[PDB]
Each structure stands twice: as structure tokens, then as C-alpha cells.
């Protein structure tokens, strides 16, 4: 009470189940199509607006209100029961008898390898005085072991028997939502002695919630205070949701339905002003005049009575009808077994249910690779040391398969022949595996067997033996790879790293003899050729994908006794960063060896191997101790989560001596056959955004046949990469050189930077033209004004755009450029924590779940197992859910105005006084039960072709890229088709009564107006439901039943409600109307004239202007798809032939 402590649940979903209902009801009426029903319910209670059954007006609303409530209940339950079983699923024991769960003031024990749902203030651990390590992965890109040095004073607790003698928690202020800060301090009073102590509590003494602890045991401390003091409750969790184009081109179509409703009341509202100033009418003697007063303002009330009358025109079952269909199409994306990864236990997981139609109208896929397109199990080395290349490969040297012969299996046996000549002789003093598919590159590296008894060090010659051994030790020291206790066969311990690149460097250095056994508390231990040398790594700087510096500053010992031991700097990065950081002038041989190795890097990227190179400066400690002070003060600074450590991690990498480079391989995800002729022959223009280099991405686009042969590879290829700080004001080169061939490549595609004649154009461009813009040639292309348009129009007329998009702001800026400046759907399929900027800045958000579920899966819009499933997700489960939902939405504005205008055409004959024609149950069950089911099962169970033929002919996706289904030209011509049939469904029942008002076979008379609205409704229900029958493909047993049931429900509610006495004027209409043959003669011929225009026009379209999807269906019935099996998946690795 006074200490203001309420208890709360952990996750912050705003729909708390105690306050679920009043927040939902206010949210239901932020829609301005059901708060319109609150106007015509409170005007249905005032007993002058001619309304019978005033309490049956809250039936067709509150049914839709509660169905949206149980829809939002399921859309809250799936957001808490499937993705959110981490609230409270573990309860710790916390026994205190000797005096995942939440309690303020708890003293929680944290073992190794567990996530902490608390803001724990550390006390001690198994290490030295509270030396805590952590893997803070779900906060930043921090894959380090960030030291959390706890309180060095009170390290006397070991168990929960002495810390349990104090029941106490502290008081803190409001939250701040900053990561590296913690302004809390605790004070405490020791027992039996007046020692006051403020134990200093800073960010080193605490650790946050969403991180994973590593390498320590029994981490102990105090949980946070209530409210919002957790620093992830505000930094991430408030995400704006998204809707489609069709869910944004719907709010125009609703207002066009309200323009028509405001006219039909305005025509009525003046035609009963004109009627109430006639003189020779019947309303003077029989009906009593001066209804409201002595004015003609009883035509302004007759305006409002048409508002209440035209309540089956306002779409109430629209925003529930899309959200039944968007949910069920997404729960069919979920429940498909051909989108299920058997090797991973992972089906497709639709994170956002309401965007199932975005996958039918996408044009740009920003599929960056090495997580997505490939398998990322990095294997080979192909070592390039001291300007000579040691390595032989024919696993992927096949990127240049355009010029070679048919089959070459003898060299794949010669790889095995050199493999057995390399594992045996190098097994001199090594105890690792060294077997088939245990070592990785067959290459006889200098035949190392020279010393037996005479010498141990050498130091006379053969520098290539030393330069290879110095390479491998510097390779197996520049890593962030962790050893692990192998549970089965514990005599061979394995390696575990967060980077699939970085683990491969040590794991083959293991195979050559330089493996590291483990890691001590300060330095590193490595078994180099029998002996186990201890290279003390005193400092390391991390890796980011925006910097490309994996750099350790490991300290070496001085080889002679009695010196100051020097240190190395192995800045292992890309093949253009350390060449931008390399010593040009030198007294060494660091000039004539560069053209040897950089030629091999071109050789070992043109065959499809990922390159990563190794340099090393030989720095001393007269210059390192000031940089370490410049780094540790920057490490003690507030910018430890910023880019101001990058300028300190820039000054020491200025000059380097190049050692060599590696050429680690990467086989594919076998998402080859979808990218060739499924996902790029559809019409979608792929955009690979690697971050890897140019020669390796060109020669992998041929391998997956993204870009095949005869692609004019118009590479941009800027020549200089330098930073500007002064000068160059009268002239320009480094910006003007790429600018002059953004115009010069407009000889292939003749255009200009001025106007957008292509925003209004869609095509899959003839002329191949795969743009290979790369890195700094893109940074100088999206700089400012009037420079984007002179390649964005080039990037429209392409079929592929390519690599070197590093530092993911560029991947953010490209997906934002092609989405904003060309209003079109993007897709952006990726994986990894550096591609969330590409996914959260796009339209669709497909993510790849690898071995673990990463941040590009839990911040996504779908999630599939591989890249192999995107061809089924887009071309089948998105192409259907476009042509379903773009067919449903024109059908729903059609069905509301075949009915609500048929009591406008009666308005002429009562002179618009607002008498009902439909008993007020046919106006009340029309949006709900009569003909609102077959419109739903048109949006859920319609397929234009089969699931196999949507992948045999993928160019049926072109009806969705062109926006050639859903447009306003389709929307108005269904309302003009409804307004036609409103004349048919009224004036065919009218022109049997207008002659002599007798329609029964026994002359007894059905002249009443409720007995006219069964002639009208039964034509308005059956010619509505048969219309939806003629506008679905593949009539099945299910939707073909709910058309036969939704037509036989208007014949059944007329039988069981016109048999009760509660139907006052409508007493026995089932016997009177249906016994009369004038019903069944006006029903069989006014259902004809409602269908006959559209059925002939959809037979005149399908004969002489046929769509592409009609021509495929004509091939379906004949022997053109006889060889294809059902459930056919053509992107599958093990499949038969056609």
C-alpha cells in the first residue's frame, strides 16, 4: 500500500482477461461501420421511425460483436499459448526450512546454460570473486563473454542456508530503459557490529533479463521491483502491425458503399418532402394528418427512417468476414505437411495471420544469402599462404561449368588419393580423428618430416614451413569457438561456435595439427604439435557484420629469455577491408606478394568459395599500452553499446603485414530448382543482398541459376574506395564516375531520371540485365536527392540485383527505397540477427529457422524450414489467397446491395415513407445466416488450379503482380451487377402483383408486403448463392454443400417461423406462398435473369479474351498434366522424373 507494490504478470499483452471486454468493445467501435449500428439502434427505440421489433436490432450487431470477440480471443490465445510458454513454466525450489516464476526480493540460484527472467544483482559464483560470463545474444550482436564482475567483498556465501537468514529487498526509482546503465545501490547493516557499508552496484554487478548465462555456476542475487524496471519491456515489444493492400483498398470500397447509402436516403429524404405537400392524396381523411407538426419536416424524419431501413447495406459482416478468411488461409499455411521440415520438427509458423494475400502480389524478393540460399556448413580451406596456394578442390570448382566437359570423376578419386596420402604422414604427434570426412582439404603441405634428433627449432631456412605454421597458429588463435565435452566418445572433444565461418578455421587447423584444447580464465591453451603452448589472450575485439573485423590481440612470449614479451594483432576480416588497412610502404616484402595472393582470391572466388583473409602487424608494447588505456577507458565509458568503440578499434589496424587468406566453401540449401524456373519464372525479381564479395556472388548466381547464361551482367563496379575530408570542390571523380554510367547504361534501357513512367507499369522485363552493384557503389548511389532515380529505374528493368550489401543499414535502405518510391510488395526472406533490419523494414517478413530459432524468425511475418519452401508458400499458398480474397471482397459488396436496394425500389410505391418489406427477420438473418456462408467458403476453399499445377506453370502468378484481379474497376462492376439484379429481384415479383394483386391459385390473395418480401428474398438469396457458385473454381463436396444448405435455410426459416403465432402478420406463409405456383414460376425465371448477364459475360470472356488461368484449366481436363503426381513438389531433393 504505502510502498506501492502491486503484483503483475510478466508479459505485457494489453488484453488482460479481467479488462478484456471493455477494451475490446471500444476497439470494436473504432470501426465506423458498427458504431453506425449504435445510431440506428437508439433511433430504433424512438417509437416514430416506423420500426417493429426494436430489440431484434441488437441481434445482427452483437452476434457480429461477439464473433469478433471470440476471434480476438483466439488471436490473443495463439499469441500467448504457442509463442509464449516462457511466462511461468519453471518454478525454482528456494527452500528456507533452516531459518519463469516471479517474486520481488527472491534470492535465485542460476546454474549454467539457462535464460534468466529476472534483473539479478549478482553476489558471487564459482569463479574468482563473482567473475561472471554471459552470452547476451537476444539484446545486441554481443556473442562475447561479457565479464560481470560481482561484489568482491561478500563472496562468503556458498549455499542457500546462510543467505536465507535475511528477508530484505531494496527500494528504487522509476525505470529508464537504458541498457548499459544501472543507478541502483544497496546499503546493509552487519550483525553485532556497527560497520556501515554501501556495496557499489554498477552494470558490472548486475545483468539483464533477455540474456543467456554461460560458463559460471550458482549465479545468485535479487529480482527486480515491479512496474517496468526491466530494460527490455520498452526497448522491444511495441511493434506496429500491418495489413495488406486489399485491407487498405477496402476502406475506399466501404466509403463508396456509404456514398450510395447516403444517396438512397437523400433521394428518399426529399421524395417524402415532395409527397407531404400534395393536396389530393389519401392521407388526409383516412390516415390522420399533422403527424409531428404543421410543417413538411416529416420528410426529414423520413430521411432517418431510410437510414434504419438500409441497414443491410452497411457492411457489418465484412471486417469479420476478412478476418475469418485471413485466419483460415494462414491456418492452412500452418497446417500443410509439404511446408514441414522433417529434419527439424518445424512446420510453417505464420506469425501474422492477416497478411495471407500479400504473398500473391509480391514483386521483389530480397533474399540475401549464406544463411538462406546456402547450407552454411563451412568445410574447405584452399589455403593461400605467402603468395602460393596450397589446396585442391573439385567439390565446388564447378561454378565455371559453362566451359568444361561432361563428367570428371577421376579427379574426385584423385582428391581421395591425395587424401589418404595426407592423413597418414601428418599423423606424427596428433591424437584427433584424421579420417574420411574428418579432415577437409587434401593437399600435401610441404611434406613435414625433417627433424628426428639433431634440431628442434631450425632457424636456418625453409620459411614456407614456418610461414604455414605461423599461419595456422594465428588462425587457431583468432576465433570465438568454444570447446565442449563430447558426451559419447569423450576422448575426442568437439567445437561449437556462433559463426559457421569461424568454427571451420580451427576445425581444419585441428586436422593439420594446431588445435586448441580449451580456454583458461585469462589466456588460451593450444596443443601445437604435441606440446601445449599457452598463448595468453589478454584482449579481444568482437565481430560485427557492419565492421568485418574479427581481431584478437593475443599476447605471445618472447622467445629469448629475459625480455618484454611482444603481442600480435590478427585482424581477420574480408578480402577488401584488410587490403584497405594494409601497409603500402614497407621495408619488408609486403608489396610483391600481394598480387600473387589477390590473384588467387579472384581464382578462389570465381569457383564459388567464400573468402576471408588474415593479416597481422608485429606491434610492440611501447605503443600498445597507450592504446589499451585508450581502449579500457573507452571500455569504462558509456559508449560500450555504441560505435565509439569502433574508432578505438580503428587506430591500431592502420598498418598490417599480410599473412594470407582462406577460401572456405559453402554448399547450397538445395534451393536451386525453385529459384530457376519457379520463383523467378513467375515474374518476381530477386535481389540477393549478400555482404560477401563480387566474384563469389556472380559465380553463385549461375550455380543456383538465378542469373543463367545470356545475362548481360551490367556490373556497376566502382574503382576507388576512399573517405573524403577536405578538398575536391571544383571537380569530382569518386561520385561522378558511377554517376556517368548510370546514364551510360541507359543505352541498353533508354530512359531518363525525370519522371516515373514505370510506377504505373508492371512487367517482368525483357532484356536480362542483372545489375551487380556492390558495396560502396551503392553507398554513393543512395546519398541524397536526384541520384536514386537514375538507377531505381534501371533496377526496375532488371531481373536480378546483387551483392556486397554490408552494414545492414544498406539492406534496410534498399528495401525501403523499392517499397516507398515504387508502391509495391516486397518480401525480404532472411535469417540471422543482422537481417531483422531488412525484415522489419519490408512488407512480408519471411524468416528461415536454421538449427536454432533466431531473431529473424521471432520478429518475422512467416517462418519456413528452408528456402526450398518459399516456392510453395508464394506460388501456391499466396497465389490462392490472393485470388480467393480478391474474389470474396467484390462478392460481399455485391450481396449487400442485391438486397438493400430491393427495398429501395419498393420505396417508389409507398412514396418513400419507410415501410419494411422483409418482416424484419430477413433483414436480420441476411448478413448472418442466409447467404453469408458461401461467401466465406469462397475465400477459404477456392483453387483456380490444383496444388501441383500452380508449380508446373509458375507464370500464373502474373495475375497478381500486375494487380490484374483486385482493382476498383472490378469493384464497381459488381455493384452495377448487383444494382441490375436488384431491379430483377424486385420488379419480377412486382410485375406479377401490379396487374390485379392476386397471385394464389385459389384466389385468396397474398397482397401483404411481408408476403412480397418472400418473393424478393428467395430470389435475392438463391441468385446470390448461385452467383458465388458460378464464381468459384473446383466445386467440391464441402462448399457445394453450404450453397445447397444456405439456399435451403431460407426455405426452412420460412417454414418454422411462419408456423408460430409470434410471427404476427406473417402467420402461415410457408403454406400460402409455396402452395401458389406463381412463386415457383417467378423464382425459376428471375434467378435466370440475374445470372444470364454475368454468366454470358464470363462465357464471352472465357472464349474470346481468355485469361491465362483459363488456358491452364483447359489443359487440366486433357492429357497435359497426366504425368504429374498429386502432392508434387518439384524443388525436392529426392523426387522422380516426369
Amino acid at each position: 500500500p504505502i510502498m506501492q507494490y502491486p503484483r503483475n504478470k510478466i508479459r505485457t499483452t494489453k488484453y488482460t482477461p479481467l479488462t478484456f471486454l471493455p477494451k475490446n468493445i471500444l476497439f470494436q467501435f473504432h470501426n465506423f461501420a458498427n458504431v453506425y449500428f449504435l445510431v440506428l439502434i437508439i433511433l430504433g427505440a424512438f417509437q416514430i421511425f416506423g420500426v417493429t421489433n426494436p430489440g431484434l436490432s441488437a441481434v445482427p450487431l452483437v452476434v457480429i460483436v461477439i464473433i469478433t470477440a471470440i476471434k480476438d480471443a483466439i488471436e490473443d490465445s495463439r499469441r500467448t499459448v504457442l509463442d509464449l510458454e516462457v511466462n511461468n513454466t519453471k518454478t525454482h525450489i528456494l527452500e528456507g526450512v533452516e531459518n519463469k516464476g516471479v517474486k520481488v526480493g527472491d534470492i535465485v540460484r542460476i546454474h549454467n546454460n539457462d535464460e534468466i527472467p529476472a534483473d539479478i544483482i549478482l553476489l558471487s559464483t564459482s569463479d574468482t570473486d563473482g567473475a561472471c560470463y554471459v552470452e547476451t545474444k537476444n539484446l545486441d550482436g554481443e556473442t562475447n563473454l561479457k565479464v560481470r564482475q560481482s561484489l568482491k567483498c561478500t563472496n562468503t556465501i556458498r549455499t542457500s542456508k546462510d543467505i536465507a537468514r535475511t528477508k530484505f529487498w531494496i527500494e528504487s526509482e522509476g525505470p529508464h530503459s537504458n541498457l548499459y546503465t544501472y543507478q541502483g545501490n544497496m546499503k546493509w547493516r552487519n550483525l553485532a557490529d556497527g560497520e556501515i557499508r554501501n556495496e557499489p552496484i554498477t552494470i558490472n554487478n548486475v545483468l539483464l533479463r533477455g540474456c543467456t548465462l554461460r560458463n559460471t555456476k550458482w549465479a545468485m542475487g535479487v529480482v527486480m521491483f515491479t512496474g517496468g524496471d526491466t530494460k527490455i519491456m520498452l526497448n522491444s515489444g511495441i511493434t506496429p502491425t500491418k495489413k495488406s493492400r486489399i485491407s487498405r483498398e477496402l476502406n475506399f470500397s466501404v466509403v463508396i458503399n456509404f456514398v450510395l447509402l447516403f444517396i438512397l436516403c437523400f433521394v428518399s429524404g426529399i421524395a417524402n418532402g415532395v409527397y407531404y405537400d400534395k393536396k389530393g392524396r389519401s392521407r388526409f381523411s383516412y390516415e390522420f394528418g399533422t403527424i409531428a407538426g404543421s410543417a413538411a419536416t416529416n420528410g426529414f424524419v423520413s430521411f432517418w427512417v431510410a437510414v434504419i431501413l438500409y441497414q443491410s447495406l452497411v457492411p457489418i459482416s465484412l471486417y469479420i468476414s476478412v478476418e475469418i478468411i485471413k485466419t483460415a488461409q494462414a491456418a492452412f499455411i500452418y497446417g500443410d505437411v509439404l511446408l514441414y521440415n522433417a529434419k527439424l520438427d518445424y512446420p510453417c509458423t505464420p506469425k501474422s495471420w492477416n497478411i495471407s494475400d500479400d504473398l500473391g502480389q509480391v514483386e521483389y524478393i530480397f533474399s540475401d544469402k549464406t544463411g538462406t540460399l546456402t547450407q552454411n556448413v563451412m568445410e574447405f580451406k584452399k589455403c593461400t599462404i605467402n603468395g602460393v596456394s596450397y589446396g585442391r578442390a573439385y567439390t565446388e570448382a564447378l561454378a565455371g561449368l559453362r566451359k568444361r566437359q561432361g563428367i570428371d570423376v577421376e579427379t574426385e578419386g584423385r582428391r581421395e588419393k591425395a587424401e589418404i596420402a595426407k592423413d597418414r604422414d601428418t599423423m606424427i604427434d596428433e591424437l584427433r580423428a584424421l579420417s574420411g570426412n574428418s579432415q577437409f582439404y587434401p593437399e600435401e603441405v610441404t611434406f613435414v618430416s625433417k627433424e628426428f634428433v639433431r634440431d628442434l627449432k631450425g632457424a636456418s631456412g625453409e620459411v614456407q614451413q614456418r610461414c604455414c605454421e605461423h599461419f595456422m597458429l594465428a588462425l587457431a588463435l583468432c576465433h570465438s569457438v568454444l570447446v565442449e565435452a563430447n558426451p559419447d566418445n569423450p576422448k575426442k572433444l568437439d567445437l561449437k561456435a556462433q559463426s559457421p565461418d569461424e568454427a571451420a578455421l580451427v576445425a581444419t587447423a585441428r586436422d593439420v595439427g594446431f588445435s586448441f584444447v580449451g580456454k583458461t580464465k585469462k589466456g588460451l591453451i593450444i596443443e601445437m604439435q604435441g606440446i601445449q603452448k599457452e598463448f595468453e589472450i589478454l584482449n579481444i575485439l568482437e565481430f560485427n557484420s557492419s565492421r568485418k573485423r574479427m581481431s584478437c590481440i593475443v599476447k605471445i612470449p618472447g622467445l629469448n629469455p629475459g625480455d618484454e614479451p611482444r603481442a600480435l594483432l590478427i585482424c581477420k576480416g574480408a578480402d577488401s577491408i584488410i587490403y584497405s588497412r594494409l601497409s603500402r610502404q614497407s621495408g619488408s616484402n609486403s608489396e610483391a606478394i600481394l598480387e600473387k595472393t589477390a590473384l588467387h582470391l579472384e581464382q578462389y572466388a570465381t569457383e564459388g568459395l567464400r573468402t576471408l583473409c588474415i593479416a597481422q602487424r608485429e606491434l610492440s608494447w611501447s605503443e600498445y599500452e597507450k592504446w589499451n588505456e585508450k581502449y579500457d577507458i573507452a571500455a569504462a565509458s558509456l559508449a560500450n553499446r555504441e560505435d565509439e568503440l569502433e574508432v578505438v578499434a580503428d587506430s591500431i589496424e592502420r598498418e598490417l603485414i599480410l599473412l594470407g587468406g582462406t577460401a572456405i566453401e559453402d554448399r547450397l540449401q538445395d534451393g536451386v530448382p525453385d529459384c530457376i524456373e519457379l520463383l523467378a519464372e513467375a515474374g518476381i525479381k530477386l535481389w540477393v543482398l549478400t555482404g560477401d564479395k563480387v566474384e563469389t556472388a556472380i559465380n553463385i548466381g549461375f550455380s543456383c541459376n538465378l542469373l543463367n547464361n545470356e545475362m548481360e551482367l551490367l556490373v556497376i563496379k566502382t574503382t576507388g574506395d576512399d573517405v573524403k575530408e577536405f578538398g575536391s570542390e571544383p571537380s569530382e571523380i569518386v561520385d561522378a564516375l558511377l554517376s556517368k554510367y548510370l546514364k551510360e547504361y541507359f543505352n541498353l534501357t533508354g530512359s531518363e531520371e525525370e519522371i516515373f513512367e514505370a510506377k504505373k507499369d508492371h512487367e517482368f522485363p525483357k532484356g536480362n540485365y542483372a545489375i551487380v552493384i556492390d558495396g560502396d557503389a551503392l553507398k554513393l548511389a543512395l546519398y541524397g536527392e536526384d541520384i536514386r532515380r537514375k538507377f531505381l529505374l534501371l533496377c526496375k528493368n532488371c531481373r536480378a540485383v546483387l551483392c556486397c550489401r554490408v552494414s545492414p543499414s544498406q539492406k534496410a535502405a534498399v528495401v525501403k527505397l523499392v517499397k516507398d518510391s515504387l508502391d509495391v510488395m516486397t518480401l525480404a526472406i532472411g535469417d540471422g540477427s543482422n537481417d531483422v533490419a531488412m525484415i522489419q523494414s519490408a512488407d512480408v517478413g519471411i524468416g528461415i529457422a536454421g538449427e536454432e530459432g533466431r531473431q529473424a524468425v521471432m520478429c518475422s511475418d512467416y517462418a519456413i524450414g528452408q528456402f526450398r519452401y518459399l516456392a510453395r508458400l508464394v506460388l501456391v499458398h499466396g497465389r490462392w489467397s490472393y485470388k480467393r480474397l480478391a474474389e470474396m471482397i467484390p462478392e460481399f459488396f455485391y450481396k449487400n446491395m442485391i438486397f438493400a436496394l430491393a427495398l429501395f425500389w419498393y420505396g417508389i410505391y409507398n412514396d418513400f415513407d419507410g415501410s419494411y418489406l422483409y418482416e424484419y427477420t430477413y433483414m436480420m438473418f441476411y448478413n448472418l445466416a442466409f447467404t453469408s456462408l458461401p461467401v466465406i467458403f469462397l475465400g477459404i476453399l477456392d483453387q483456380d488450379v490444383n496444388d501441383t499445377i500452380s508449380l508446373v506453370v509458375p507464370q500464373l502468378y502474373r495475375v497478381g503482380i500486375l494487380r490484374k484481379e483486385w482493382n476498383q474497376r472490378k469493384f464497381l462492376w459488381y455493384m452495377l451487377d448487383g444494382l441490375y439484379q436488384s431491379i430483377i429481384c424486385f420488379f419480377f415479383p412486382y410485375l406479377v402483383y401490379h396487374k390485379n394483386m392476386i397471385v394464389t391459385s385459389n384466389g385468396l390473395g397474398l397482397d401483404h408486403r411481408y408476403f412480397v418480401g418472400v418473393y424478393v428474398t428467395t430470389i435475392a438469396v438463391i441468385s446470390c448463392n448461385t452467383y458465388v457458385l458460378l464464381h468459384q473454381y473446383r466445386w467440391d463436396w464441402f462448399s457445394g454443400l453450404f450453397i445447397a444448405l444456405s439456399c435451403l435455410v431460407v426455405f426452412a426459416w420460412t417454414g418454422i417461423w411462419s408456423s408460430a403465432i409470434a410471427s404476427r402478420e406473417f402467420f402461415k406463409a410457408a403454406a400460402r406462398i409455396y402452395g401458389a405456383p406463381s412463386f415457383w414460376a417467378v423464382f425459376f425465371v428471375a434467378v435466370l435473369f440475374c445470372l444470364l448477364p454475368r454468366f454470358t459475360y464470363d462465357s464471352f470472356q472465357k472464349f474470346f479474351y481468355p485469361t491465362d488461368v483459363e488456358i491452364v484449366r483447359e489443359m487440366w481436363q486433357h492429357g497435359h498434366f497426366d504425368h504429374y503426381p498429386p502432392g508434387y513438389d518439384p524443388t525436392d531433393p529426392n523426387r522422380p522424373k516426369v
Partner: protein, 362 residues
């Protein structure tokens, strides 16, 4: 193991008859529909050509007729007999005022004397046509009480219920007593008493009867039930007080269950033409000749320039004589046989043939 269920509904592999509108299914379909609706359109014009009706208006027997047999405007009468033998002959009418009921707006007795050359069949319907009577407005058709229809002795505030039909215009008389049939519908009842016979004047004088029982549906006598009031607290409606001149006795309260021509009037017609049954004769075939109806004029049709008439017919299976459902099935036959003919001569004489597969992307 979250594998999704594979039971052909989450896998979407249902029955799927899969209709494709080839020109060898649409062109027999229009040959199938248009060969039905030119036989149905023939049989409806075969049946409805043989319907005989008599429509005679009488809103001006009070002024435009004399006590002798008077002028016959052809604006009024419409005989439709399918044997065009006595179709141009005029039905004459006189007027017998007698100057006793002193109403002077609609009184007297118009005695129409028409002539039927052909014979109707055994059922004979004597309707009444009320053109330009505004019977379908908002305040009008929502003015009665359902409980008083169902035989209930309701109170003053229970004929003023919010639920739809109440009696808000006709609630009480001058001394605070409720009406027995309240609301403007029962207040505005057609008065004109047709006699129970068509007298066979001129030729033989053997009269042709017309029963007023069996007029409404017989199944409608389950919500029209006899009153339960105490003959004192009810008044007649203020336009019925000249057929109940003193009020209600203990014995003049109308049983609304068997009073079938009131049961028709509480069923308001939808449009500005009203045609209700008031006299039937199921038993006797009407022979040829010259008959006479003696209409007791009481209902005013001159303050709104409307009409008032008589519809004598033998209603067929479709009900009445209307050439609409014969024309429409022939328009259904003429359009379907034309859309078959347009989509066949654009097919064989130019247009396309379904012979290729390179039409989509070539």
C-alpha cells in the same frame, strides 16, 4: 513432434468436380435452358390466354348515373373474354339514392348490370379493386393491436407498446374508453356491402349465389379469435359509428374470427392497388347471360381522386390474368437462344479455337 495433420482438409484435396466452361458445355447449356423456357413460355401463354375476367369501376355511380339505366364510360369497364363475342357491349348501371342516410358524400346504391358471354368454371371470385388508396405508409400499416386480433381484453397502456404495432392514433374516445378494433387499418375498412347473390335479371330470374364464407385462408382462424371484453369499456372506431350508431350493446360486438371480410382488410396490400376477396362461390358454375350486382355505396373515393371497382374472375393456377409470366419465359427463351447463337457464330465463323497451349506466354 508438431507435424501437421494430413487428413485431406488441412491438405485441401476435397471432391472437386472442377467445372471448366468449354464451348462444348456452355453451348449445350444454352441449348438446354432455351429449349425449356420456350415450352414453359408456351404453356403459360396457353393457360393464361384462356382466363376470363371482369373489371368494372363504380366510383362515379353517385354523380355520373341517373335513376334510369345510364351512360357507360369505357374508362370504367374492362371485360377480358377470350372468346371475343360480346366484348364491346356496355355494362349499364343505375343509382338508387332514397335520401335516408344523409351522408351526401358516398351514399345510395349503384346497381351494375353486366353481361358475361362465356362460362366461368366452378370457382368464381368477386374481388374489389381500390386504386390510388394509400394503404402502405409508415404510420398506417403499423396501427393495430395483435392481442386484440388474438382475442385479448387489453388495457390502455397495452395498446401503446413500443413493439411495432400499437394503436397510437386511435387510443381512446372522448370519455376515455378504448376502441375495440384500434389503429388506422381497421378504422379505414372498406364499407361497401356486396350482396350474397348475382341476380339473374332480364332473362329467367334464377339467381346466382355468392357465399361470404371461405374468403380468407381457413388456417387464418388461429390468430383471429373472438373478443373477451365486457361490452362497456370498448367503443367503435370513429369512422364506424354509423354502422354501430349507439355504441356497443351486449350482442352487437363483432366476432372477428368468422367475420372474414374484416380479416382480409387487416392484411394491408403492398402497393397502391388493393384487390381483396369479399365474395366467393365454390359450388356453382356461372352460366352465360346478364347478371346484376347491387353495391351499397358507403366508402368515399373522391377526396383523393381514386378509384373503386369490382374484379370478377376465375383465378387460374398462376392467379389472375397477367401476360407477364408468359412474356418473361419467352424473353428467357429469346435471350438464351440468341446468346447461344452469338457465341456460336463468333466461334465457327471467326474468333478462336481451343487448339493451342501457347496463348498465355509465347
Amino acid at each position: 513432434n508438431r507435424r501437421p495433420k494430413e487428413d485431406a482438409f488441412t491438405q485441401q484435396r476435397l471432391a472437386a468436380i472442377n467445372p471448366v466452361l468449354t464451348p462444348r458445355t456452355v453451348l449445350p447449356l444454352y441449348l438446354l435452358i432455351a429449349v425449356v423456357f420456350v415450352i414453359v413460355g408456351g404453356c403459360i401463354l396457353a393457360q393464361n390466354s384462356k382466363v376470363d375476367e371482369v373489371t368494372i369501376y363504380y366510383q362515379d355511380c353517385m354523380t355520373n348515373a341517373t335513376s334510369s339505366w345510364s351512360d357507360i364510360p369505357s374508362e370504367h369497364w374492362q371485360f377480358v373474354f377470350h372468346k371475343y363475342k360480346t366484348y364491346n357491349t356496355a355494362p349499364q348501371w343505375r343509382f338508387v339514392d332514397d335520401e335516408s342516410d344523409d351522408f351526401t358524400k358516398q351514399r345510395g346504391t349503384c346497381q351494375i348490370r353486366f353481361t358475361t358471354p362465356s362460362d366461368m368454371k366452378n370457382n368464381v371470385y368477386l374481388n374489389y379493386v381500390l386504386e390510388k388508396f394509400a394503404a402502405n405508409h409508415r404510420r398506417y400499416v403499423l396501427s393495430f393491436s395483435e392481442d386484440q386480433i388474438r382475442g385479448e381484453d387489453a388495457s390502455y397502456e397495452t395498446v401503446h407498446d413500443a413493439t411495432g404495432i400499437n394503436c397510437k392514433p386511435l387510443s381512446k374516445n372522448a370519455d376515455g374508453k378504448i376502441y375495440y378494433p384500434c389503429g388506422l387499418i381497421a378504422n379505414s375498412m372498406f364499407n361497401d356491402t356486396f350482396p350474397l347473390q348475382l341476380t339473374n335479371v332480364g332473362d329467367t330470374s334464377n339467381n346466382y349465389s355468392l357465399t361470404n364464407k371461405g374468403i380468407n385462408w381457413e388456417s387464418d382462424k388461429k390468430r383471429y379469435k373472438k373478443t373477451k371484453y365486457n361490452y362497456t369499456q370498448i367503443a367503435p372506431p370513429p369512422y364506424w359509428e354509423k354502422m354501430y350508431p349507439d355504441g356497443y350493446n351486449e350482442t352487437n360486438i363483432p366476432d372477428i374470427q368468422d367475420w372474414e371480410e374484416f380479416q382480409n382488410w387487416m392484411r394491408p396490400g403492398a402497393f397502391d392497388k388493393i384487390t381483396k376477396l369479399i365474395r366467393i362461390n365454390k359450388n356453382d358454375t356461372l352460366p352465360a347471360g346478364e347478371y346484376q350486382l347491387d353495391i351499397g355505396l358507403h366508402w368515399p373515393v373522391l377526396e383523393f381522386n381514386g378509384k373503386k371497382g369490382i374484379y370478377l374472375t376465375h383465378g387460374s393456377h398462376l392467379g389472375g390474368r397477367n401476360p407477364f409470366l408468359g412474356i418473361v419465359y419467352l424473353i428467357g427463351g429469346c435471350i438464351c437462344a440468341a446468346m447461344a447463337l452469338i457465341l456460336l457464330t463468333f466461334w465457327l465463323f471467326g474468333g478462336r479455337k481451343i487448339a493451342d497451349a501457347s496463348s498465355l506466354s509465347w
